Ligand binder design. Structure first.
Ligand SMILES: [Mg+2]
Ligand SMILES: [Mg+2]
Ligand SMILES: [Mg+2]
Ligand SMILES: [Mg+2]
Ligand SMILES: [Mg+2]
Ligand SMILES: [Mg+2]
Ligand SMILES: [Mg+2]
Ligand SMILES: [Mg+2]
Ligand SMILES: [Mg+2]
Ligand SMILES: [Mg+2]
Ligand SMILES: [Mg+2]
Ligand SMILES: [Mg+2]
Ligand SMILES: [Mg+2]
Ligand SMILES: [Mg+2]
Ligand SMILES: [Mg+2]
Ligand SMILES: [Mg+2]
Ligand SMILES: [Mg+2]
Ligand SMILES: [Mg+2]
Ligand SMILES: [Mg+2]
Ligand SMILES: [Mg+2]
Ligand SMILES: [Mg+2]
Ligand SMILES: [Mg+2]
Ligand SMILES: [Mg+2]
Ligand SMILES: [Mg+2]
Ligand SMILES: [Mg+2]
Ligand SMILES: [Mg+2]
Ligand SMILES: [Mg+2]
Ligand SMILES: [Mg+2]
Ligand SMILES: [Mg+2]
Ligand SMILES: [Mg+2]
Ligand SMILES: [Mg+2]
Ligand SMILES: [Zn+2]
Ligand SMILES: [Zn+2]
Lengths: 116, 71, 134, 48, 178, 57
RNA sequence: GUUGCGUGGUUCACCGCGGAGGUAGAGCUACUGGAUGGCCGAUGGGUUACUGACGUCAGCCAAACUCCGA
RNA sequence: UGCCUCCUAAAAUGUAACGGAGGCGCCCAAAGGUUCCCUCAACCUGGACGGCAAUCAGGUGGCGAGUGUAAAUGCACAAGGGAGCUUGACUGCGAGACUUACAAGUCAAGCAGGGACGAAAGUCGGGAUUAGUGAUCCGGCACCCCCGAGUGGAAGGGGUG
RNA sequence: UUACGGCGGCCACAGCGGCAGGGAAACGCCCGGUCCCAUUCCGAACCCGGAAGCUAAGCCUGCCAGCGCCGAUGAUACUGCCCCUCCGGGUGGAAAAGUAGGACACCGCCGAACA
């Protein structure tokens, strides 16, 4: 409840300065206690171009913990973005603090090819 | 009584539909009576200049009156 | 009849044009006095008319004054040349437009009520008539 | 109370910046890191 | 393991469920936190409460408290803005459990003329408040090394939504009421 | 932050003259605490002029 | 204003289209102030017929009031 | 008697009076930059001192608090409150504009150097904005080594701050 | 395609509030503080490893004009330009308030079960 409201507040605050275009989409995240989600939005027409989450074959292809799952989905979304033809994005915290699973996602994508 | 200060010549300088060059001042104001939109900077004293050549466009952005430039 | 406070001691004269749009009908009593011309009715005139009505009825009935003189008027000292600062407030005045109801009265006897209202009207610097609550 | 102070590069001693400070609030000499055009980079500066 | 918490989870939850027919298991009242604050008056005079309040609250409770500074300025109280006037700590979890157990066991009966906590000091929502007036009888603090005497207050906050449920929860936990 | 700020909170044991003894974790005192009254022994937990004239006269 | 040399409809008028407004008016339980009559009753008064706060019910006022608005 | 804010001022700008109201001749080495986080006043209930009003807890509360300082326009998306690191309170520029008799005044994207913060995107050429100021002449100081009255120096002058 | 989780558009006709129904995937509530990280005190929050329990809450669906919001037409106020000596009139614009009414949102992209 209040956690949801405060998260939305922080996400809006950070989004005030952060949009993401067609050439440089928005690396948005959505983390839950059980899973995470990530997609590229291109906040110019509201048209998602690539997406990923933690509910795939990776839900059992787990070499460790939630951090390993985040790393795997980072690789997956990086491959999806390369397939789409995207090599620069803007990372969106989604209102959560950078670090942990989010950091694993971010650096997994970073060394998997995305230039952000 | 009897004192005063100089008139500051505030207000809108370019209106909707006007073709402007990059850097043209559009609105002189105190505070953000209008708010910068796409292709519109603010300036150190809320000056709302044009960052690109185009046409002026006034709009609404959930409460805030905005000025934007369309190319 | 003087206000307890005003935010601006010196104000521009109230504009004397148009017809009154509010307070054009009797609302409190069943008899009233309706103005027909613009004027600056003063607290002294209001007090005179109120005392006239009260001292003619001498008992019973109720009188309402639905106007308050809260607009100040200034006057310079008598012996002074032109233009050395605005003068100090001297009078308290109410801006009255045609159609505005000035006084409200209720009384068992229509004749006495009408006589008292006429006595009040003859003390005011306006042409005024007597209107009923239909 | 707020005099005009000058800051000189600690290396080349060139006077590059002039500003103000409150003498009572900072009774000692101001220290700042400012870009020195002569040295070509940022150096420590001190009041003169 | 907190014995009072174990006793709660063993029987008090069932007792509250019997007393009030909750449709789900987590509608049962539960204490959320315990808050103890000073609100000293020696803020504009001698300004020495870090030893007067913190040094005793820490040993009384188990955690160092937070310092609260004045939110305004009052000439009548000689109150200025910006200096500490009160020190507040909050106790939660097993620390709160142990503090409540120790209180209800040895501290509450041990003050002067203990005639029981009044059961009418509820806030109307399901949380209770009461306070002493001197250096409490906590054996953690002894008179031999204390400054001028000062009392304290406790706010106990529960998941209960009604005063009757809060009173029942406190009574089951062991609060001696009238 | 719990590095050096919070006081020590280590296991203790309360011994009462009544006999009611329980063990918890208390502050800097690591030893025992000797008490004479507990919740099991304190009061409130376990509970005429005419007559005076009659007995006087 | 006149006049020489450049420019040539760029000026102005009407019609259409795109724009900013806070005047007239109006309103105010939309703010800041003023203000009439009731109901309720805050305080103060010697058990209170005396001051009658706040709200609320109707009616009002404003260059430095504006939820509005030509 | 100069500068800033409101009304007069008649819904662009501008507009007089010995017209109606106020402010300025500063302040802050953080009250500057950046990153991250938070939401106030008031009212109600409960609570030793503590009471109308000190700190505490729970509700209600979208701006009625607050903004270094007058007022206006803004700011709750915070420009308000808290904390970490720092000195961009830079250097060389600047397309294009507002205002304007002239002299002045004002805004400015962006480029380069060398940096601060940030994981990055980015932001940063003082301060929510608008007052806190004085032309030219003549002198002082630091630096560059530009001219140097036969020559070499020097005196003196010159440029930058 | 049905109805769910996100991202947006728009910023009340969309809000607030009341009344009912849901936990497949999911979203949350939830278990602990060993590791990253943090409390001007508190693993309350943030962060970390999880699913013992659950829709009671959040959330979603449907119904409510209750508060709140939108709001005509006509008339009037006001008004540009003419007539006119004022009075008023012609001609062209045209409110605010109020009334009738509306309304418990609408639209796009991605993902899961189902399609
Ligand atoms: Mg002015
Ligand atoms: Mg500035
Ligand atoms: Mg009116
Ligand atoms: Mg007469
Ligand atoms: Mg200092
Ligand atoms: Mg218009
Ligand atoms: Mg105005
Ligand atoms: Mg008017
Ligand atoms: Mg009003
Ligand atoms: Mg007005
Ligand atoms: Mg004006
Ligand atoms: Mg104007
Ligand atoms: Mg002065
Ligand atoms: Mg600041
Ligand atoms: Mg800082
Ligand atoms: Mg701030
Ligand atoms: Mg400077
Ligand atoms: Mg230039
Ligand atoms: Mg650089
Ligand atoms: Mg820049
Ligand atoms: Mg300032
Ligand atoms: Mg001279
Ligand atoms: Mg020579
Ligand atoms: Mg020389
Ligand atoms: Mg399920
Ligand atoms: Mg925890
Ligand atoms: Mg639920
Ligand atoms: Mg339910
Ligand atoms: Mg109409
Ligand atoms: Mg209307
Ligand atoms: Mg609704
Ligand atoms: Zn140097
Ligand atoms: Zn005992």
């Amino acid at each position: 409840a209040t956690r949801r409201i405060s998260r939305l507040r922080r996400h809006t605050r950070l989004r005030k300065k952060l949009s993401g275009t067609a050439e440089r989409p928005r690396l948005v995240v959505h983390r839950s206690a059980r899973h995470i989600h990530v997609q590229l939005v291109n906040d110019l027409n509201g048209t998602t171009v690539a997406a990923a989450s933690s509910i795939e074959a990776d839900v059992r292809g787990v070499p460790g913990d939630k951090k390993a799952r985040s790393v795997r989905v980072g690789q997956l979304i990086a491959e999806r973005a390369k397939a789409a033809g995207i090599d620069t994005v803007v990372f969106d915290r989604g209102g959560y603090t950078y670090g942990g699973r989010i950091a694993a996602l971010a650096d997994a994508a970073r060394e998997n090819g995305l230039s952000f | 009584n009897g004192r005063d200060s100089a008139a500051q010549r505030l207000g809108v300088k370019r209106y909707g539909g006007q073709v402007v060059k990059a850097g043209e001042i559009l609105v002189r104001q105190r505070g953000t009576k209008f708010h910068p939109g796409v292709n519109v900077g603010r300036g150190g004293d809320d000056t709302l200049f044009a960052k690109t050549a185009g046409a002026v466009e006034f709009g609404i952005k959930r409460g805030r009156k905005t000025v934007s430039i369309v190319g | 009849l003087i206000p307890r406070k005003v935010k601006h001691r010196k104000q521009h004269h109230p504009r004397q044009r148009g017809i009154a749009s509010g307070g054009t009908t009797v609302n409190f009593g069943d008899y009233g006095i309706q103005a027909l011309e613009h004027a600056y009715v003063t607290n002294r005139q209001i007090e005179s008319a109120r005392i006239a009505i009260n001292r003619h009825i001498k008992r019973g009935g109720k009188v309402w004054i639905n106007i308050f003189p809260d607009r100040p008027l200034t006057k310079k000292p008598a012996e002074t040349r032109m233009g050395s600062g605005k003068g100090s407030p001297e009078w308290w005045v109410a801006n009255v437009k045609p159609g505005r109801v000035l006084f409200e009265l209720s009384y068992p006897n229509e004749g006495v009520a009408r006589a008292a209202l006429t006595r009040a009207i003859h003390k005011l610097p306006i042409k005024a008539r007597i209107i009923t609550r239909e | 109370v707020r005099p005009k102070i000058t800051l000189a590069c600690e290396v080349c001693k060139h006077r590059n910046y002039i500003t103000k400070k409150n003498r009572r609030n900072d009774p000692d000499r101001l220290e700042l890191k400012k870009f020195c055009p002569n040295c070509g980079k940022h150096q420590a500066h001190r009041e003169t | 393991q907190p014995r009072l918490k174990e006793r709660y989870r063993s029987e008090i939850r069932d007792a509250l469920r019997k007393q009030f027919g909750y449709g789900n298991v987590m509608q049962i009242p539960t204490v959320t936190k315990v808050v103890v604050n000073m609100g000293v008056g020696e803020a504009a005079r001698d300004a020495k409460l870090i030893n007067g309040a913190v040094n005793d609250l820490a040993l009384i409770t188990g955690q160092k408290p937070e310092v609260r500074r004045a939110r305004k300025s009052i000439a009548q109280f000689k109150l200025r803005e910006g200096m500490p006037v009160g020190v507040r700590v909050t106790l939660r979890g097993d620390r709160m459990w142990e503090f409540l157990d120790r209180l209800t066991s040895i501290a509450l009966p041990r003050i002067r003329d203990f005639r029981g906590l009044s059961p009418k000091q509820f806030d109307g929502v399901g949380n209770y408040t009461f306070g002493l007036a001197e250096q409490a009888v906590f054996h953690e603090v002894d008179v031999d090394k204390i400054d001028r005497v000062r009392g304290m207050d406790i706010n106990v906050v529960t998941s209960a939504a009604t005063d009757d449920e809060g009173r029942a929860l406190l009574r089951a936990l062991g609060f001696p009421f009238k | 932050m719990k590095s050096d700020i919070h006081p020590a909170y280590e296991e203790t044991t309360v011994v009462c003259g009544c006999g009611n003894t329980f063990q918890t974790r208390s502050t800097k005192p690591g030893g025992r605490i000797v008490v004479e009254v507990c919740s099991q022994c304190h009061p409130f937990y376990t509970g005429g002029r005419v007559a005076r004239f009659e007995k006087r006269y």
